[PDB]
Design an enzyme around this catalytic site. Structure first.
Site, mmCIF file in Angstrom:
data_model
loop_
_atom_site.group_PDB
_atom_site.id
_atom_site.type_symbol
_atom_site.label_atom_id
_atom_site.label_comp_id
_atom_site.label_asym_id
_atom_site.label_seq_id
_atom_site.Cartn_x
_atom_site.Cartn_y
_atom_site.Cartn_z
ATOM 1 N N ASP A 32 0.815 -1.099 0.014
ATOM 2 C CA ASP A 32 -0.031 -0.026 0.088
ATOM 3 C C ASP A 32 0.964 1.231 0.108
ATOM 4 O O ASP A 32 1.283 1.679 0.970
ATOM 5 C CB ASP A 32 -0.840 0.290 1.208
ATOM 6 C CG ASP A 32 -2.295 1.162 1.219
ATOM 7 O OD1 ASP A 32 -1.860 1.991 0.186
ATOM 8 O OD2 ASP A 32 -2.870 1.102 2.137
ATOM 9 N N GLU A 43 1.611 1.657 14.100
ATOM 10 C CA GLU A 43 0.530 1.405 13.129
ATOM 11 C C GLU A 43 -0.838 0.513 13.911
ATOM 12 O O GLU A 43 -1.222 -0.345 13.307
ATOM 13 C CB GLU A 43 0.621 0.941 11.853
ATOM 14 C CG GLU A 43 -0.341 1.099 10.760
ATOM 15 C CD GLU A 43 0.094 0.436 9.473
ATOM 16 O OE1 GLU A 43 0.377 -0.814 9.479
ATOM 17 O OE2 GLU A 43 -0.223 1.338 8.496
ATOM 18 N N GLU A 101 -9.834 -4.536 16.453
ATOM 19 C CA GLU A 101 -8.586 -5.301 16.928
ATOM 20 C C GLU A 101 -7.981 -4.717 18.095
ATOM 21 O O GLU A 101 -6.922 -5.430 18.959
ATOM 22 C CB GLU A 101 -7.276 -5.051 16.008
ATOM 23 C CG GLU A 101 -7.537 -5.597 14.204
ATOM 24 C CD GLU A 101 -6.471 -5.548 13.713
ATOM 25 O OE1 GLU A 101 -5.182 -5.580 14.085
ATOM 26 O OE2 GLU A 101 -6.653 -4.966 12.367
ATOM 27 N N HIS A 145 -6.067 -0.293 2.224
ATOM 28 C CA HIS A 145 -6.598 -1.611 2.761
ATOM 29 C C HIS A 145 -7.727 -1.496 4.011
ATOM 30 O O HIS A 145 -8.333 -2.299 4.425
ATOM 31 C CB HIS A 145 -5.195 -2.475 3.345
ATOM 32 C CG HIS A 145 -4.727 -3.128 2.115
ATOM 33 N ND1 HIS A 145 -3.738 -2.571 1.197
ATOM 34 C CD2 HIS A 145 -5.076 -4.170 1.389
ATOM 35 C CE1 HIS A 145 -3.225 -3.305 0.300
ATOM 36 N NE2 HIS A 145 -4.021 -4.090 0.477
HETATM 37 C C1 LIG Z 1 -6.353 -3.463 7.365
HETATM 38 O O1 LIG Z 1 -6.798 -3.706 8.530
HETATM 39 C C2 LIG Z 1 -6.283 -4.623 9.303
HETATM 40 N N1 LIG Z 1 -4.894 -4.471 9.407
HETATM 41 C C3 LIG Z 1 -4.263 -3.724 10.426
HETATM 42 C C4 LIG Z 1 -2.999 -3.414 10.277
HETATM 43 C C5 LIG Z 1 -2.354 -2.873 11.297
HETATM 44 N N2 LIG Z 1 -2.075 -3.383 12.658
HETATM 45 C C6 LIG Z 1 -0.735 -3.740 12.881
HETATM 46 C C7 LIG Z 1 -0.735 -4.587 14.244
HETATM 47 C C8 LIG Z 1 0.902 -5.430 14.340
HETATM 48 O O2 LIG Z 1 1.189 -5.169 15.612
HETATM 49 C C9 LIG Z 1 1.325 -6.472 16.215
HETATM 50 N N3 LIG Z 1 0.567 -6.306 17.491
HETATM 51 C C10 LIG Z 1 -0.559 -6.166 17.861
HETATM 52 N N4 LIG Z 1 -0.838 -6.271 19.069
HETATM 53 C C11 LIG Z 1 0.345 -6.203 19.774
HETATM 54 C C12 LIG Z 1 0.731 -6.291 21.103
HETATM 55 N N5 LIG Z 1 -0.314 -6.025 22.076
HETATM 56 N N6 LIG Z 1 2.051 -6.500 21.426
HETATM 57 C C13 LIG Z 1 2.686 -6.498 20.325
HETATM 58 N N7 LIG Z 1 2.555 -6.579 19.008
HETATM 59 C C14 LIG Z 1 1.252 -6.340 19.103
HETATM 60 C C15 LIG Z 1 0.487 -7.546 15.321
HETATM 61 O O3 LIG Z 1 1.002 -8.766 15.697
HETATM 62 C C16 LIG Z 1 0.842 -6.986 14.173
HETATM 63 O O4 LIG Z 1 2.146 -7.318 13.660
HETATM 64 C C17 LIG Z 1 -2.194 -4.183 9.383
HETATM 65 N N8 LIG Z 1 -0.763 -4.416 9.459
HETATM 66 N N9 LIG Z 1 -2.786 -5.355 8.551
HETATM 67 C C18 LIG Z 1 -4.275 -5.498 8.455
HETATM 68 O O5 LIG Z 1 -4.628 -6.148 7.582
#
Ligand SMILES: COCn1cc(C[NH2+]CC[C@H]2O[C@@H](n3cnc4c(N)ncnc43)[C@H](O)[C@@H]2O)c(N)nc1=O
Ligand SMILES: COCn1cc(C[NH2+]CC[C@H]2O[C@@H](n3cnc4c(N)ncnc43)[C@H](O)[C@@H]2O)c(N)nc1=O
Ligand SMILES: COCn1cc(C[NH2+]CC[C@H]2O[C@@H](n3cnc4c(N)ncnc43)[C@H](O)[C@@H]2O)c(N)nc1=O
Ligand SMILES: COCn1cc(C[NH2+]CC[C@H]2O[C@@H](n3cnc4c(N)ncnc43)[C@H](O)[C@@H]2O)c(N)nc1=O
Lengths: 343, 343, 342, 343
Positions: free
Chosen positions: C32, C124, C133, C281
């Site tokens: 993206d 992010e 989430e 996304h």
């Molecule tokens: C598009 O909407 C959904 N989406 C959202 C995002 C943005 N979210 C990143 C979270 C990233 O952060 C990690 N994560 C989540 N909670 C966490 C926590 N307590 N401690 C450490 N790491 C954590 C998780 O494993 C991932 O690597 C993305 N990278 N792809 C997606 O498909």
């Protein structure tokens, strides 16, 4: 009953069969100015309904009664002669208002009420206000009204104005000249041309138009529902004298109506004028048999006479003449069977 | 006691004959060139069936078919019409110098008296889905005036029904009913009437035309032979069907149309209202299922279309259909008297 | 025992971090260009906020944001990631010769130990409708490691909601539920389950994009200040709204999108998922009414959007809305955990 | 319980959450081939159901039990572990079959059944038949089956065939090469290219294809549900020896399955073959890490070993060699997390 004596059986059957369809109710409910204005008129005048006894004449699905309930009414008697009354009964129950709204199936002229009411609500207006002759039922219902009572609506104004519409006028002959041919599949139809023309001009035209076709300020006839009696609407004479604003050919008279809800807090108007957003009443135009020529400043005078018939409608007789020239025109129309021209 | 009045509610008959008393109505049907031209062809090309013959015109209207019979050389034509149009027919007879050959007899054919028996009966009794208006019974009733060797124009009628797919029409009707699902229309819960609404909308047959590609099987034919049938045969009409599905998909209902045949001495002339033919004022009629049925090509769709005559000059329609291979069944009830003109 | 585990069902967390362990997923977001490019732009143009600073990257994934922090001149970056992707990030740190500046710390940010406080937090955490989430809570939780005057990238988040009209979408969902209206599916009467079917289908938020012309009023904005907000602030989110209707018609539901802002010392950079901007996304999210509300121009549409956080790392959505002038009211419940991707 | 012992809780949670949605039920119901074939197998073998005791394993909304009822079953015990069980109970009530159908919420391995049954009906098939590991539940349920009892389906056939799909194979590298760039926004991603390739090749590909990619007649592995024990499905060794019909590069193995309902009256087959209309099972393809060249007439031999895991799925180990040349290739795949490639 008063209703049956002034109404042909055949007409009433068709009439209440028409109002037994939910799509019919829906048609008017979806007319937002109508429904919204009624709701507004009732709610903004809540002191006229709070803890009051109400009569809803021709409640249909009962929507107006629910508005009366929203305004805080103590008791609403909802009268409806069509089968729609069932559906109203269903709605009252499903809305938990069985304690405040009582649906009474039948004609308001024939049913019995347990007590007198403080206010009558209704929507008796038809085309050109008077069509369907329900105004009479609404006035008849005042036998149940306390001397302190009110009527929603309180008054009705019919407006008449001369118009010019060369195309609308020529349209009639364009359609009737179908019969003016000497060999339609070998048949000479011409002898019926006159009768065809006659038939077309007897129909009032239901639709809307540009206000610029109006050639003079409207003349107004008012029915005060608090004061009028049923008998007052069997013969309605509307004299007029129009002061012409434009020069040209006057092809007939245009009709529309307003009603007013005169409440204790405020007066709310429902208008079907061509200057306002369109409603399911549209506007009504009655053609002259022969157009009248007038110049700006001339006077167009005459009478519109409405005679009620047992088909729940009126025979319209219109006579008009240009005073300065003496040019005269007449027409006779059957309001029960108008021509829906709107596209 | 008249046969007509015994099977007809007063209110319906009044309205019925008022509708057909308007010249615009006559013009509308006359201007269908396929209809008028085909009738003239059927009569003129079988002129020997009319030459020096006695004719009965049932429901003659303006009298055009009688004029065709006159053109064909008929010796005497009795033209019967119950509406006020009969007066207009008389005018044309005089103006066309046919007073010695066409005699207009005002009244219902079940009630008038005819001076003699006739050689042939001509009429246009077909309504929507052929049977609407119940005039076929009047047409058959009139056979009391027919000589033993006499003929009928038209001679037979074929009703065609076929399953169709039309997602848009279905959703179109369901969308209208979805108004009544609202839990808060101006604060009012309408949902309790949702069931009653959908019932009301799907109760209406759809009158209009369509593309033949929506048809999912070869049509099934039901034939009425006017020379042989009795009035009573049309009080209960049971049409069994077994369709062999040619395409896979959702069956949203059954489509109806009809053909009539003028079986004359020289030739047989057909008048068709099929969707494969140019459009007529009969159009085609579709009865929607409340629930569509899925079927694949090669499957069998079976059931019955049952028509029960009512006192409103029409039929209560009950349609039951089943996919034999799965047992998916659908049932429906329609009121043919009050269709939805969608065109 | 930890804040994370106490607010999260195990099964959900397992599935959750299993999802983020796939390289194709990482690739999917990295590709993206708007997202990645904006992040690099926000970090690099505000290089002074990173120059010789201590950094925390919350949920670093492949470690890309940390590399941006490294490019900007950061002294030391602690990159925390709970999924197995953390192993892959370490490989990249080594292959890019940045072992002296990026330190990968495997585990949940609620559970790991950091040697020192940081000057700035990068992450992010945004999900669908921003809040899905529930990672914003992790992002905010991480402020226990932030020096008092420290900074957050992103610094604020704006959620936008607006009423829309889309009959086709509505009948699309309505067409699906009527399957259960059949009184004879292969001879079986399904009708008794219709109500449950309508409920299930309309509970799903719709993820996709649309033409801005379907919006019937100016959007209402709800702002989260990440510098000020606490975890607890996101357990129950009540968003009041009052829309001034610009067009007449049927309101079929509410559309949601979000912006985040990186408020740096040199400049402020915005990342937008609005329908007026190129598609991301995150797409946009729409919550349908079971029955649409009619409103004409000039009317006011009022009510509340209530978000209750659940143990499945998501939200229970309650939307109540009314046309003030007529009293036409609607109430609705949606399950953000079960979206419909059309 | 047996189920709990072979299943990680988290997987089970996800699993039954998936099957609790009506949309999910609807999707399988809308597969006409699937549903119709089940109905056909039951109804055309009505003697296998007339006045019999039936067990429905994983009844979902209860469709198959209703079919068993249509076939004349005396009593049906319908077991379902997801929340859908409540919805089945609703349908049983609304279909007035509470006297014939008993819904039992819970896992078939854990619930209590009162009596032995004459026949077990179920739909335990997953991708390439074995995915989800529900066949074990189906076989486990035979503790409630009388000797001489029956199973619907009675047998299951998994088919394997070598395929050529150059594009599919090269696709994996086109995607993985995303990581083979020295400056993605200034980052060298190259070190992860290998891991990306590994990840893609571990996923079996779910979609459909043209049968012309198949280079040999399939090899079939049969599970006889009447004879098999659940334990037989913990380790499934499928040896294969293909007789190559076409020359070219073999990129991997294609999988599909059939089930047969062997009743007293007839045998009915449900096929998910690529030669048949597509179902929600599609087909499954497992790539070789390196393609093998084979000539028409050559033999491609080896084994497909399926090892069951507690995530309700299988680790697939495939080894293959071209006998005539000795060219050997292998792959290891995770069936629980396939790649949906279908368009
Ligand atoms: C598009 O909407 C959904 N989406 C959202 C995002 C943005 N979210 C990143 C979270 C990233 O952060 C990690 N994560 C989540 N909670 C966490 C926590 N307590 N401690 C450490 N790491 C954590 C998780 O494993 C991932 O690597 C993305 N990278 N792809 C997606 O498909
Ligand atoms: C605009 O064209 C005419 N028009 C007028 C209106 C307004 N008029 C409602 C009368 C309603 O009142 C009912 N009604 C009429 N005479 C009645 C009577 N003696 N006793 C009881 N109910 C009566 C009648 O059944 C209907 O439900 C409308 N709702 N739709 C229309 O289409
Ligand atoms: C739905 O469209 C069908 N349709 C059919 C026709 C053909 N139908 C003539 C009936 C004509 O026959 C008349 N009529 C009906 N029943 C009659 C009866 N017992 N005795 C005498 N006349 C009768 C009736 O007054 C009308 O003039 C038409 N002219 N216009 C139509 O719109
Ligand atoms: C297309 O491949 C996936 N797939 C497969 C199928 C066929 N498998 C039905 C399992 C049905 O059986 C249920 N089920 C599974 N293990 C069970 C167990 N120990 N005890 C009771 N019910 C059980 C489960 O809840 C579902 O209702 C389907 N109906 N839809 C699908 O999407």
């Amino acid at each position: 009953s008063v209703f049956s004596e002034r109404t042909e059986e055949s007409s009433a059957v068709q009439y209440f069969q028409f109002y037994g369809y939910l799509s019919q109710q829906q048609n008017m409910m979806q007319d937002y100015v109508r429904t919204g204005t009624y709701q507004r008129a009732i709610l903004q005048n809540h002191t006229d309904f709070k803890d009051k006894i109400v009569l809803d004449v021709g409640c249909g699905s009962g929507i107006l009664s629910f508005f009366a309930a929203q305004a805080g009414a103590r008791k609403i008697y909802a009268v409806e002669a069509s089968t729609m009354a069932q559906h109203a009964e269903v709605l009252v129950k499903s809305n938990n208002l069985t304690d405040r709204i009582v649906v009474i199936p039948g004609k308001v002229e024939e049913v019995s009420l347990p007590e007198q009411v403080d206010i009558i609500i209704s929507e008796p207006m038809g085309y050109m206000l008077f069509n369907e002759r329900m105004l009479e039922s609404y006035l008849h219902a005042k036998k149940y009204l306390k001397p302190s009572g009110n009527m929603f609506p309180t008054i009705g104004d019919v407006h008449l104005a001369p118009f010019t519409d060369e195309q609308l006028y020529m349209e009639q002959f364009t359609k009737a000249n179908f019969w003016y041919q000497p060999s339609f599949h070998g048949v000479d139809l011409s002898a019926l041309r006159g009768a065809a023309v006659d038939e077309y001009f007897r129909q009032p035209v239901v639709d809307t138009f540009d206000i610029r076709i109006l050639m003079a300020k409207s003349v107004k006839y008012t029915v005060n529902f608090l004061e009028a009696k049923e008998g007052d609407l069997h013969r309605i004479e509307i004299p007029f004298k129009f002061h012409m604003l434009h020069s040209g050919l006057v092809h007939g008279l245009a009709f529309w109506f307003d009603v007013a809800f005169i409440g204790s807090i405020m007066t709310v108007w429902l208008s079907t004028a061509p200057t306002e957003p369109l409603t399911h009443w549209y506007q009504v135009r009655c053609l002259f048999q022969s157009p009248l020529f007038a110049k700006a400043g001339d006077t167009l005078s005459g009478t519109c006479l409405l005679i009620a018939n047992k088909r729940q409608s009126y025979d319209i007789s219109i006579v008009a003449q240009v005073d300065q020239t003496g040019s005269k025109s007449s027409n006779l129309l059957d309001l029960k069977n108008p021509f829906f021209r709107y596209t």
